[PDB]
Symmetry: C2
């Protein structure tokens, strides 16, 4: 069936490696390795350009010769935690060789029958891969934990070690304006450990004209006046009547700061709630300056709109599933299934702006927070159940009819989603086009000294979820059709290269995050396993083997690991250690650096 | 059927009110109101004895004329939170009059049929009582919250405002013994906010002979030497090799103390875990001095032993259920069902010693923690399903066969559990017997100046769970057989009297707890409601009315309330407010008071 798709896939994926064979030598040599332009202005990496023949050592095995020790200093440890995540999962399928070889040895038809049961080789090997998954994510859980500790004890002085964010202040006015009253409160409740506080603004109206003002003073050589009017009356009115219940304050030492960040303050935790303040580029001020009382109802309504998005998103799955030359008419619904889910990062970003999370670093984990929960019921059980609902004891023959067919559809889909996508992301067609067009245009604006540059963030919004759907497909369809695993293997074995290249090539992190997403994705992969064992119980459930000592210990194990891992590491990550704070203490404190660390502008 | 049980119930319950008509006038006038012996030695309450005729104002309406304003100062606010709990639930069934009157108006037989549907009057009134339950427990949730705040801001100086408990210290020895090393750690990590620390002991071996030594020096006039030997070598050996990873330390001001209690410390929260230290009489030192790494496995195995206790405890339910003069042969299995579950507080105490909770105040909430989870599946669905499994469309006729029969069994059981039990607890047969016998005996020991006294703790271990089972029965069987509600009513309407009397009569609290159990029991009653709506879905599920807008909004409401209440109050209670700490600050600090606040002895 899908022999055509590996044919053409290999064809123009080796053709987009052929365009990379033509890339490195060029006048665009500045645009391709734009990461080091972060380190120094002209530094591209050494000026030899790193070319060999196919450059196997010059990119692939330079990515092999450099290792995780420099991944933390070169770029933020966030890139480190994603790289070590994909390596953990690489082991997750690298063990699976000893599943796939045996299950390939036993591998209208003889098909699968009740007596041979296969489930000491099948379910025994899913016990094998389940066990080694626990081993990998446990091992690397501790590992990335000590990597995070390592990055916190070795971190330099940043303003956020002294920073705490306070959300709900008393609404009522007792006799003074906000500023003086809050400062008097802190003075009464602390023995001179406080510094000063900065209030919050509704400025998103003057911000709507501010970012646009940062463009308006850019339009002078292409309107430089009028906006100062909305910089005047509107902003003054907002300041006079509408500065919210939220603000930020800072303290003398790191220890007092974090300790303050952990504890609740007032008798009613509906008042004076406080969370550790992230970095200005991490936090989102627009979604900040809102009320938690309404945040409850926002979690409510947003969680309703996911319920409308799932059932509204059912119909494309039935559109594509009925399809499975004539396989290019499977192309159109598959690539349209991509570009129909390729908007899902933007859709769940439009939901991820309105949900109320203070930090975009903690917002993204909620963006995949929508994506996983969204993808389980449509791109998997909607697509599987789509294979079942079409082409119809008897229910057993239908499940055993769909699982191979929906397995070839799933395999073909991770083949297009993987093999072609990493090729596109390799030679980055959009930077090479915007190089010609914008270098022809942005020169006309007298900006020729400054390229657009900045390839963009490592962008987990398009990264981790697109890594989630494949996770689900791999796990679930591993047991029923193990061949997907050998082409699930080929996924990360190539990915581990390219993104690593990418990691050291263009992306400069927009997050200094120390692994925020990692515990999220960590309970995520566990959930994915749980789906593999329950859906697996759907597989065996028709096959009728002994399931007591089979399914009940699997679910019991999943449960106890959920408990033990949450109550073990989870809280350990969610906050910063104060021992690292006092033991860090480089003995170079200051004050004025923290004031301009935010500012309204 | 159960007309006999209200006959005799009224008979000897008015006979045990007749023995209270004979009680107050006596030479035992010191033993009956033993609460004020806490206030002063001889003070019994005013020496008029509080007698009227039946003494309606002298106990009942003295309990009416005194109110919750003095419940907090007279005895601990714990008694206050239990009293206000039973008052909340009193409203929970006081609203229900407007359910029971209508559902009594519509009230082999015409029985219940599909078309009239009754569920605008039935399910509409369970929407009515569900709604007003939310209203009562919400209202009184805020109410008891401000009562707790009120008791914390008005509290006097206790040692536990300066106290924090640390559980896991570093296991390895780096060059000094524990004491000096821990103190140096605190010195390095705090700017002289610390005071001094007290280590932990394995002394339960010298304690095994210590409490017994406190008896051995009492045996001198009835062995006063030998134990000092096990006070020597064994204790010294333990001290030399086995003082655990746990200890307690204290700080200069309340604020630093609590703030320290909230935050995690080290990078690995598997090390340096810290919780707010309760009072010595609240905490349990024997279950203290254990490891959390093993506490995980203890929650594991204990939660397995509940799984053996439920299925091992199935058989008495089938023993009693097949029963329903011949009704005294229903007596024997009912009273044996009492005394068979009357050991459950002791059984779940034997489980509640081994589970690892540091505070017996937080342990008891886990004792009912076993009791509710234990009672849902046996005394309710085991007893209901016991009525179903016996006396056998058709399944509909069987559920509609059991629910009335198991409803008369349930009603008869809350009739014996309520009416007779509060009568026994009124005139307290065991104190009046131990008065004669021990006043005849303990005088022979030359202790005649000191009675045993001390009626015992208010003893939630036998209180809150015995209040849980009735909660379940009331809710679940309210819709199918509303008459139980009018005899569920009669439960608390009498209880509100007697225990209140009891509250002001004998019990001196063994807990200074400020309402620890209240959030526990608060999500508990909510769970009970949830069982009423799901089991209710079992009731209507055979009746076949429109259940979309019926059951799905009920479960959605239960969910959103779970979220909003947990994320609203729950964390707000679980710890103490630091604003109350700084705003309390009576400006009379000390040091030496905290050292002897514990001590090994």
């Amino acid at each position: 069936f899908g022999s055509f798709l590996v044919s053409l896939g290999t064809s123009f994926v080796i053709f987009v490696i052929l365009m990379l064979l033509f890339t490195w030598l060029s006048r665009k040599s500045g645009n391709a390795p734009i990461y080091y332009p972060n380190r120094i202005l002209k530094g591209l990496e050494p000026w030899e350009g790193t070319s060999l023949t196919r450059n196997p050592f010059a990119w692939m095995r330079e990515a092999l010769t450099s290792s995780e020790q420099d991944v933390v200093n070169l770029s933020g440890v966030d890139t480190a935690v994603h790289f070590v995540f994909l390596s953990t999962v690489l082991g997750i399928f690298a063990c699976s060789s000893l599943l796939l070889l045996p299950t390939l040895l036993p591998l209208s038809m003889a098909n699968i029958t009740k007596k041979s049961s296969r489930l000491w080789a099948f379910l025994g090997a899913v016990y094998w891969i389940s066990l080694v998954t626990y081993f990998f994510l446990w091992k690397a859980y501790k590992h990335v934990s000590s990597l995070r500790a390592q990055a916190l004890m070795s971190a330099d002085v940043k303003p956020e070690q002294f920073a705490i964010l306070v959300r709900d202040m008393p609404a009522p006015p007792d006799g003074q304006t906000q500023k003086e009253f809050i400062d008097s409160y802190f003075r009464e409740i602390y023995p001179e450990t406080f510094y000063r506080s900065l209030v919050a603004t509704e400025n998103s109206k003057v911000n709507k004209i501010w970012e646009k003002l940062e463009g308006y003073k850019k339009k002078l050589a292409r309107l430089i006046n009028e906006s100062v009017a909305k910089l005047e009356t509107e902003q003054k009115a907002v300041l006079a009547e509408k500065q919210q219940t939220a603000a930020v304050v800072f303290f003398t030492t790191r220890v007092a700061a974090a300790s303050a960040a952990q504890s609740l303050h007032c008798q009613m935790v509906d008042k004076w709630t406080v969370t550790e303040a992230p970095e200005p580029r991490q936090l989102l001020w627009q979604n900040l300056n809102i009320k938690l009382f309404s945040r409850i109802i926002r979690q409510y309504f947003i969680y309703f709109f996911v319920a409308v998005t799932i059932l509204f998103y059912m119909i494309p799955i039935a559109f594509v599933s009925a399809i499975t030359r004539t396989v290019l008419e499977s192309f159109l619904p598959q690539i349209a299934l991509i570009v129909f889910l390729a908007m899902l990062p933007k859709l769940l970003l439009f939901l991820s702006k309105a949900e109320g999370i203070p930090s975009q670093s903690h917002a993204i984990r909620a963006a995949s927070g929508k994506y996983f929960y969204f993808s389980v019921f449509n791109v998997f059980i909607g697509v599987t159940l789509a294979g079942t609902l079409f082409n119809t004891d008897m229910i057993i023959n239908l499940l055993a009819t769909s699982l191979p067919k929906s397995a070839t559809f799933f395999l073909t889909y991770v083949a297009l989603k993987f093999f072609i996508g990493y090729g596109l992301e390799l030679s980055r067609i959009i930077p090479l086009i915007i190089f010609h067009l914008k270098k022809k245009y942005l020169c006309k604006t007298e900006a020729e000294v400054k390229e657009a540059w900045y390839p963009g963030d490592l962008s987990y919004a398009t990264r981790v979820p697109g890594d989630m759907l494949i996770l689900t497909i791999t796990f679930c369809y591993s047991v029923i059709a193990p061949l997907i695993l050998i082409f699930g293997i080929t996924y990360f074995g190539l990915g581990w290269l390219v993104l690593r290249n990418q990691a050291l090539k263009v992306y400069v992190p927009s997050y200094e995050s120390y692994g925020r997403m990692w515990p999220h994705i960590h309970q995520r992969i566990l959930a994915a396993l749980f789906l593999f064992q329950v859906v697996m119980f759907g597989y065996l459930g028709a096959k009728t083997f002994f399931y007591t000592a089979l399914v009940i210990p699997l679910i019991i194990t999943s449960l106890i690991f959920g408990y033990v891992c949450r109550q073990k590491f989870y809280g350990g990550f969610e906050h910063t250690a104060l021992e690292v704070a006092c033991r860090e203490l480089k003995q170079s404190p200051d004050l004025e650096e923290i004031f301009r660390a935010y500012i309204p502008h």
